[PDB]
Design a protein around this nucleic acid. Structure first.
Lengths: 49, 82, 50
DNA sequence: AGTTGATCTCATATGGAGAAGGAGCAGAGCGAATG
RNA sequence: AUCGAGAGGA
DNA sequence: CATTCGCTCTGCTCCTTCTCCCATCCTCTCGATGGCTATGAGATCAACT
């Protein structure tokens, strides 16, 4: 059962990792210290808070 | 944007330090004049780091703001954190 | 008992909620944003997006 | 201004999850016709 | 050389 | 003139349909794909004079 879980869990977790990156890859701290996406919409007014 | 009220942080970012050092090293390798005395150091990147600590690098950083304005800061105006 | 710094969770939850509705981390969310078509095509639905 | 010859070219013979469309159908309410 | 298949490594 | 009746128009389920996606990188071997003969007419223009 441990060998099966080690072989089967990996596709689901790696797909989750991909989808997260593709959802957030352009989100950046700007020089005004706001956090914005590529369409320049405000996600956070200060990083973290 | 008026230059009398620059609002970006007075500290140099890690990314600014990285690119300033790279650009200046490439300039020194292309025989740009060196703004510091050399203790016989010959590596363009070591020379660039000497000029950085001396505040002598002749480069302006143009910080673009999200609204499309910018601030120009000299490398000698910024606080170097490393 | 694992720990992740709050700002990472906060930024994911804000990404999922900044549009005023629950945006899924799936083509049905991510590829329905105003992001440009080249960004969308790098994820999923590559040819239909274009 | 007139004459030659390669060469091409036709043609011959024998799992699952979400999203979208349609049909069913209930029933609201509008307007004509009473009764 | 390509396409496909199979067997392996972390 | 107060129904009443009939007819049009939503909009709420429950299918059928269909389209999408399924960790990263690396090594090796093996099978398969793998395409007439020839003689004629006849148009082109490269190229001799």
């Amino acid at each position: 059962e441990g060998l099966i879980d080690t072989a089967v869990k990996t596709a689901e977790t790696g797909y989750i990792q991909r989808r997260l990156i593709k959802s957030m890859e352009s989100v950046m701290v700007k020089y005004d210290a706001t956090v914005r996406n590529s369409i320049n919409q405000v996600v956070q007014l200060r990083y973290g808070e | 944007q008026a230059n009398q009220k620059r609002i970006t942080t007075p500290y140099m970012t890690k990314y600014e330090r990285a690119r300033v050092l790279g650009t200046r090293a490439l300039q020194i390798a292309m025989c740009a004049p060196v703004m510091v005395e050399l203790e016989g150091e010959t590596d363009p990147l070591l020379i660039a780091m000497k000029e950085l600590k001396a505040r002598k690098i002749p480069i302006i950083i143009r910080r673009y703001l999200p609204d499309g304005s910018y601030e120009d800061w000299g490398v000698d105006e910024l606080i170097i954190s490393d | 008992g694992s720990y992740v710094n709050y700002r990472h969770l906060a930024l994911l939850c804000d990404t999922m909620t900044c549009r005023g509705h629950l945006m899924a981390i799936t083509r049905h969310g991510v590829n329905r944003q105003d992001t440009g078509p080249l960004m969308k095509c790098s994820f999923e639905e590559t040819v239909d997006v274009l």
